[PDB]
Amino acid sequence: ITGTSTVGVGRGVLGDQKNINTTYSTYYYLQDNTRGNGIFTYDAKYRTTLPGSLWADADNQFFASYDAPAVDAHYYAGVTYDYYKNVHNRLSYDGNNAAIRSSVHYSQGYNNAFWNGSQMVYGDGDGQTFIPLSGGIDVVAHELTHAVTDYTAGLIYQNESGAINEAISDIFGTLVEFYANKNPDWEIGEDVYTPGISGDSLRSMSDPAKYGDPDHYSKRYTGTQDNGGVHINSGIINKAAYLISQGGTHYGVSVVGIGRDKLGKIFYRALTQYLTPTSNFSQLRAAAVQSATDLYGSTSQEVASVKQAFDAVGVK
Ligand SMILES: NCCc1cccnc1
Ligand SMILES: [Ca+2]
Ligand SMILES: [Ca+2]
Numbered sequence: 001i002t003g004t005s006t007v008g009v010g011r012g013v014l015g016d017q018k019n020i021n022t023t024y025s026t027y028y029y030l031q032d033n034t035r036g037n038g039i040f041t042y043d044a045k046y047r048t049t050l051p052g053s054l055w056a057d058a059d060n061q062f063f064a065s066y067d068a069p070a071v072d073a074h075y076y077a078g079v080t081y082d083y084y085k086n087v088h089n090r091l092s093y094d095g096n097n098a099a100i101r102s103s104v105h106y107s108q109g110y111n112n113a114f115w116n117g118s119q120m121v122y123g124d125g126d127g128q129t130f131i132p133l134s135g136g137i138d139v140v141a142h143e144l145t146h147a148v149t150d151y152t153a154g155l156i157y158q159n160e161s162g163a164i165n166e167a168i169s170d171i172f173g174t175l176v177e178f179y180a181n182k183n184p185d186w187e188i189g190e191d192v193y194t195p196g197i198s199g200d201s202l203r204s205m206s207d208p209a210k211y212g213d214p215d216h217y218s219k220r221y222t223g224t225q226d227n228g229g230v231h232i233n234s235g236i237i238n239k240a241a242y243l244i245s246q247g248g249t250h251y252g253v254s255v256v257g258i259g260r261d262k263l264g265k266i267f268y269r270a271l272t273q274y275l276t277p278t279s280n281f282s283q284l285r286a287a288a289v290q291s292a293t294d295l296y297g298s299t300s301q302e303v304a305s306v307k308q309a310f311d312a313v314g315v316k
């Protein structure tokens with residue numbers, strides 16, 4: 001909407017206070033005009049119609065329990081925008097400052113969040129499996145990264161290309177979590193998953209098998225569930241990315257780590273220059289090798305480490 005840019009204050013899902021960019025016109029709206037063509041957050045009001053209503057607040061203070069998922073969806077979309085702009089010189093998900101839209105309070109007890117091709121959508125969780133999913137910065141950034149993928153490589157959401165799609169979202173979700181530097185880790189969703197259980201998460205990149213996901217191509221899922229295992233076989237690529245960044249020995253193969261920043265540069269370049277809608281795991285390895293060659297040189301440690309990491313997970 002048309003109005004003037006303002007700064008509100010609120011509390012997120014985890015009870016932390018933060019400032020949020022709003023717009024004043026009669027009401028204060030969750031519309032951040034400081035980033036691209038705007039970040040807009042909507043109330044789905046427990047329904048499944050989307051987007052719902054642009055979030056309106058009478059006083060620019062967002063401390064009600066009902067406000068918390070909206071505060072975090074809005075704020076973490078801003079952090080994710082900042083990561084892509086400041087780290088990769090990418091302006092929003094399309095590279096042209098497309099407006100970023102999110103809806104919260106989607107459905108009732110909905111234990112998921114997603115990018116729907118047009119916008120991000122967050123359930124509130126059922127209070128046992130999840131609390132409202134926008135409380136996880138890695139979740140928010142995972143979702144917005146699907147939009148980046150859609151506009152770049154276009155990886156089809158099935159089988160190996162879909163597992164790459166998922167892993168790219170986990171990788172950049174994690175790199176955004178490190179960028180914000182609040183309790184960063186290599187696990188996915190820990191801040192919103194199972195409030196009654198400490199120390200768990202949906203997935204681990206450092207040890208995918210902790211939650212039943214494969215960490216070697218020989219253990220890949222070959223069935224039809226989950227669009228051919230897109231959230232399962234992602235563990236093979238997540239493990240490779242973890243090894244590239246942090247190093248380690250895995251099934252007897254040693255990888256010299258090169259750090260998170262170079263991991264991000266290599267995978268961002270692979271995603272935006274080399275991957276295609278039908279890329280498989282072997283093609284991802286080649287894309288990563290070529291990206292590291294472009295950035296660091298063919299004889300570099302970085303190229304050598306990409307090769308050892310894919311070797312370690314059984315991808316040639
Ligand atoms: N992401 C968990 C995949 C899975 C499910 C059930 C048993 N083993 C593995
Ligand atoms: Ca208020
Ligand atoms: Ca964390």
Ligand SMILES: [Ca+2]
Pocket residue numbers: 138174177184185186187188189190
């Ligand atoms: Ca995490």
Ligand SMILES: [Ca+2]
Pocket residue numbers: 190192193194195196197198199200201
């Ligand atoms: Ca938990």
Ligand SMILES: [Zn+2]
Pocket residue numbers: 142143146166169
């Ligand atoms: Zn995903």
